[PDB]
């Protein structure tokens, strides 16, 4: 049986990951319908990565004899490519902060395996952040139109 | 641009499908940790099927120039195998009813392609219901213990 | 042109075989919907075997310049696994008796090739009976619940 | 549990499909013994297609908690190739009419999945009718003898 | 023999589909000679899809004992990429409307298989419309020049 | 050492089978020179089947310590396709009768293995008769000219 | 930029080729529904060949800075196999005449590449004519019924 405080931090992470799943998937479908099929494929992949994170969190909570809360998911959606990237980045920044605090809480309470899980999430999060910051830097340098064109497919593909 | 009433019925279905995704996936992890790895694999597959349904609903709403609502997901969880099956079945019964009413609404408003989508969902739902009713009938006949054993793997598998 | 008495015995066998086809196939679908998918597959195979018997009977009647009577099919259906097996067994017992009398009638009338056909049916029938008696003996020894479990598949199969 | 009226329409279709199975199979054996082995192979295939229809009807009735009636099968048999085709066509015309009325009954009662099954049967039936009308048109144009020759194999085949 | 009103709706659809074939193929050749070889390939594919639609309509009219009218084809041609897409989209909008009215006419007259054909056309039409609206949205976002470049091949290809 | 009466019945069958070999082979060569190469191939196959029958009869007679009589072979030859088929059929009718009487003689004398050999010959004979009656029925229905054409090859074959 | 007179001759050929496409395709579907599936396949192939001709004409007109006229297509349809062949032949005779005059016009005006295109069409046309005259000669010699039978498939094919 796990610490109530640790289970609570795991559920907070689960809430964020479920929100990230929905936001990334909505962005995938919006981007696809706008014609940015290449970037859309990446957002789909990012959504599926957050799905695996939520699964690991659920698995850990059950092992600790807690109750995973999937009953709740706030979503930030953009109207253009730049706002989609910035919304994803904002969510990753919020997740990183939550996991950094959760890591310390698990460390102080002696739940080192749960600490290890948050460390893994932290490493994954900054990998996400590095990619998104790079894409936003590229968009700023070549312009949103050229960034959109680069991430759109020609009419005869697929 | 689609009818507001049709978009609203599509969003109601999306809310149910997102709830079904979470419930099926939670059941998959609960069943797996209880040792019912075979039934757990099926619940995982059912979750992924509802994921595809939610994707089709999102896609249709966007095409109709509406806004998909993923910001919301009620979850019914069981404490044993029988209650897990009955909770899944209850959700499918509720989904079938919603889709049957939505089909008629789309028909009367002349949105026949959205009607076709609800018809496809209805056919899928009763396929789910047929399977679940069969499993619950089998459980009643051979008993919950034997049903659990039949859907558990030996210790050396995987 | 064949003996009227032989043609009549061939049509009596055809009536029984068509009844066996329908009974076995109904049992296949009932057993499948109850969750006994393994035994259901066997009943399907048994139905198809009786289908081939009916075909041979039709073929022989036509060669004898008679008229096959497919216009008629009595069906005995069970409510549980044991009654399904006992109903199949009862039909096979009735078929064996009919074929044993038909064999002698063909022998006395000098239609030895039609006699040979009934001998083949007799050998097939007692093969059916041997299998069914064995299954009913197993059910009695291990119990109907365990017999049902043994002939049911786990939820994730197929 | 399904509507009694829907179950009754499903059983009426089952009666027709079982009749079509027997008629097509008898025609297959008659045509084969007359030497029209090519057309005979097609009638065999048509019989097996109606067998699959009867299976789907049985499956649907069981899912609706009704009792499939296989205890009954009227057969129309011809004495030449043209009458065989016309008898098959007559049965398909009768089946189409039954399914068209059954479709409307299921629609009014809100059993849309059963409606979908009758729609599938209707599409299959008119596919049968199109083929049979074409064969009868060809027979009229080139004559019954040439039609028979075209659908007979030489003595050394198979 | 089919309803005169249904045959008339099928011929109206045939007129539209034949017009769409010619318009899409002309656009394919115009776009190819302008250097937009990628989009040109898609327009060629769209033309061939409408060719298959016209074939299904002809086939249905003949089965209903009507006379397909191929003696007639109005064509809207653009002078740049955007006007080509908008002309295709306009034709698809007109086809969708015709098929939606034809579906209802077939439903009221009890020709459900012809209704099914218009439903299939409707689903195909909105698939066309979804693609074209997406391409026009992309063109608006990245500009006609970049859209043209994205759908043009370099000088050494093929 | 076998019964003289059984050996005599085996030699009577051998005389008939040797006659059938020669008649079928002569028919094969006549039909081939008339241009009915397809039917000719079948007559060749039938001749070779009767050759195997004669071999089994010789083998059985030797095992019974009798002397096979191959020193004798009456042949019925036709002048057209129909008379060839009718002559073959007449011989098979005569063989069937001989084997039916021989079967009973072996049964009464207790030579059950020789009885089994005549039963095998009887089954083979009625297979021959079924084929020949079918071909003669086909010839009557489509006419001798069309039957001949169906069983003739074009000038460039082989 | 091309001669107006040459562009006009190219558009006249395009009108004829589009008419030939529709006539051949209608004949393909009529012949198929009458049961002449073999000849129907050839008419389908002929239709597709005229489709390629129309494409080459469109391509040449665009290269000459003219406007292809696809807005227009007269169709001659038969009621039996012979009239179908004669209608196709009549159209090919009319096309040959048009192309022979167009060739001379291009020659006199010094547009030798357009002349080359009409020469290619002329060679193709007389290939069509040779085939059609041969088929009509065969039909006259063996009769329309036997010609129809030769170009019909047995009921079990495809
Ligand atoms: C509790 C929430 C969710 C969980 C735990 C979850 C989990 C998963 C997992 C583990 C996979 C396997 C990935 C793979 O096979 O590569 C997956 C796939 C997938 N998920 Fe999610 N997911 C969730 C929510 C969603 C949502 C909201 C959608 C919206 C459409 C969605 C759509 C998909 C799709 C389309 C796939 C791919 C399946 C396929 O390609 O056949 N999922 N999910
Ligand atoms: C006169 C009655 C019948 C005759 C003569 C008959 C004959 C046959 C034969 C010879 C086969 C081939 C078996 C094989 O391919 O392994 C077959 C297959 C089959 N039959 Fe029957 N049958 C009859 C009635 C029925 C009925 C009442 C049903 C009810 C559903 C049925 C369902 C099937 C099915 C599903 C198959 C398998 C076909 C496939 O897998 O594609 N048959 N039948
Ligand atoms: C301007 C008029 C037309 C043009 C330029 C045209 C052009 C073409 C071309 C170039 C092909 C490729 C042939 C191949 O892949 O072997 C084709 C195929 C085809 N066309 Fe046409 N065509 C026209 C009208 C029609 C019409 C009126 C029909 C009526 C149904 C039709 C039906 C087809 C079909 C069924 C195919 C085969 C496609 C497949 O098998 O996937 N076309 N057409
Ligand atoms: Ca015996
Ligand atoms: Ca409908
Ligand atoms: Ca020259
Ligand atoms: Cl989308
Ligand atoms: Cl778990
Ligand atoms: Cl079932
Ligand atoms: Cl037969
Ligand atoms: Cl004649
Ligand atoms: Cl071009
Ligand atoms: Cl010879
Ligand atoms: Cl003939
Ligand atoms: Cl057709």
TrEMBL record, chains A, B, C, D, E, F, G:
GO terms for cellular component: cytosol. Mg(2+) 2 binds at residues 49-50, 53, 128. GO terms for molecular function: ferric iron binding; ferroxidase activity; heme binding. Fe(2+) 4 binds at residues 50, 92, 125, 128. Its cofactor is heme b. Fe cation 3 binds at residue 49. This is Bacterioferritin. The lineage of its organism: Bacteria, Pseudomonadati, Pseudomonadota, Alphaproteobacteria, Hyphomicrobiales.
């Amino acid at each position: 049986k796990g610490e109530p405080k640790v289970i609570e931090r795991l559920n907070e992470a689960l809430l964020l990951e479920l929100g990230a799943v929905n936001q990334y998937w909505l962005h995938y479908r919006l981007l696809n319908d706008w014609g940015y099929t290449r970037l859309a494929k990446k957002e789909r992949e990012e959504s599926i990565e957050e799905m695996h994170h939520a699964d690991k969190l659920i698995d850990r909570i059950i092992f600790l004899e807690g109750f995973p809360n999937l009953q709740t998911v706030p979503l930030r959606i953009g109207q253009n490519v730049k706002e989609v990237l910035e919304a994803d980045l904002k969510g990753e920044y919020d997740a990183r902060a939550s996991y950094k605090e959760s890591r310390e809480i698990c460390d102080k309470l002696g739940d080192y395996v749960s600490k290890q899980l948050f460390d893994e999430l932290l490493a994954d999060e900054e990998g996400h952040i590095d990619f998104l910051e790079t894409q936003l830097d590229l968009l700023a340098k070549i312009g949103g139109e050229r960034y959109g064109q680069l991430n759109a497919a020609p009419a005869d593909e697929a």
